[PDB]
């Protein structure tokens, strides 16, 4: 039995030897068709307490259909920073037949301050996002249910819960998925301690982003004030003075994300905007803090890493873009990896390099070692 997980600080960039970005080996972490009629999608991607790195998936039996397929999440780790890949993993596993569930589309949040690592993810039995109706029962096979996975040993075991009623405070929230990709504990200002993660809902009003957050640590999750419309799979991050900043895939196809901005730690948000510099095809990315230890006032704390396929209409140039400024403009975007790319995700290593995740042909692991940063963003 694996021992309890100890409270213990996320990871900052690291000063590597490198002056230009490069990737490092490519690891085929999963193949479709390995084995025969599974396929594999959708990457989350973590450095838990411990320094693990941590991979999740969805694996999607029969092919790579969206839920209700009954899909499941799986997990692989590294306890070498990527070099080195452990045997898959199931977080939870979907079941086949006409009672099917399904758990798809993994996120993962990290907790430094108890190192408790959170896996949100849906729950479907026959509808899908799409399909979905209102209701929170959860039995209701009619709703497509939000789940989280909690783990107290640093990923090696798993308690599931179905958190749809706690974070439906709208009756007429007829569907709901947590972004995959990562969410976030806030570290700085007045709601430090805070874990939050960003859905796509749709309601009376439209399709919106919404914020879902935990003031205990994860025990209990509360939703925020939804923004927007036409949003999608969006992801916030915590800026240089505490406000928060949420990314966004756009539904109404802009060929641009969407960005919006929260004084109050993800209860409200102000108005959605596109971000002219940051081409995107409608398409998940991630954005994370290179330096999320760094304090407010600091060049490091305002320093942002974002992956996407930089490109209008087609999920390709898996791209990682720089922003020096707290988000305010992109200085730097360059490719890692020319042609298709699909969903990217990206997450700071404990060796201070950045790990990607994205999608061809199953999932693909590389590292991105960091001594470059500071020629595009001085560090001083
Ligand atoms: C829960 C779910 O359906 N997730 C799917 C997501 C979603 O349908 C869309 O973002 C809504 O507009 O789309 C895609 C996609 O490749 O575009 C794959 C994700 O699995």
Same mark, same amino acid.
């Given at each position: ?9 996320? #990871? ?12 490092? #080996? ?11 009629? &599974? ?28 839920? #209700? ?73 009619? &709703? ?33 998925? &947590? ?46 004030? #939804? ?154």
């Amino acid at each position: 039995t694996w021992p309890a997980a100890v409270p213990a600080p996320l #990871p900052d960039v690291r000063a590597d030897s490198s002056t230009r970005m490069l990737l490092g #080996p490519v690891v085929d972490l999963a193949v479709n068709e390995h084995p025969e009629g &599974v396929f594999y999608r959708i990457p989350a991607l973590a450095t838990a307490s411990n320094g693990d790195l941590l991979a999740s998936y969805d694996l999607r039996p029969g092919s790579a259909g969206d839920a #209700p397929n009954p899909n499941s999440i799986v997990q692989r780790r590294s306890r070498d920073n990527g070099r080195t890949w452990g045997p898959q993993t199931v977080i939870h596993a979907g079941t086949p037949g006409r009672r099917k569930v399904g758990y798809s589309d993994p996120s993962y949040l990290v907790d430094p301050a108890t190192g408790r690592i959170l896996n949100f993810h849906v729950k479907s039995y026959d509808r899908g996002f799409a399909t979905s109706e209102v209701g929170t029962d959860p039995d209701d096979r009619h &709703v497509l249910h939000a789940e989280v996975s909690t783990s107290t040993d640093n990923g090696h075991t798993w308690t599931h819960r179905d958190i749809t009623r706690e974070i439906t405070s709208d009756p007429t929230t007829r569907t709901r998925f &947590v972004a995959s990709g990562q969410g976030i504990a806030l570290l700085h200002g007045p709601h430090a301690g805070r874990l939050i993660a960003q859905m796509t809902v749709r309601n009376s009003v439209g399709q919106q982003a919404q914020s879902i957050y935990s003031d205990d640590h994860g025990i209990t999750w509360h939703a925020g004030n #939804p923004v927007g419309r036409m949003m999608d799979e969006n992801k916030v991050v915590e800026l240089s003075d505490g406000t928060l900043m949420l990314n966004s895939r756009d539904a109404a196809r802009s060929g641009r994300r969407k960005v919006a901005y929260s004084q109050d730690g993800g209860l409200t948000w102000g108005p959605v905007k596109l971000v002219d510099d940051l081409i995107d095809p409608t398409n998940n990315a991630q954005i994370i803090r290179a330096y999320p230890n760094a304090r407010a006032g600091s060049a490091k704390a305002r320093i942002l890493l974002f992956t996407n396929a930089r490109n209008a209409t087609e999920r390709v140039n898996g791209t990682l873009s720089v922003s020096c400024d707290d988000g305010r403009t992109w200085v730097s975007h360059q490719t890692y990896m020319p042609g298709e790319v699909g969903y990217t995700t990206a997450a700071v290593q404990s060796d201070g390099a950045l790990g990607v995740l994205w999608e061809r042909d199953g999932i693909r692991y590389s590292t991105i070692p960091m001594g470059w940063l500071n020629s595009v963003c001085p560090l001083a």
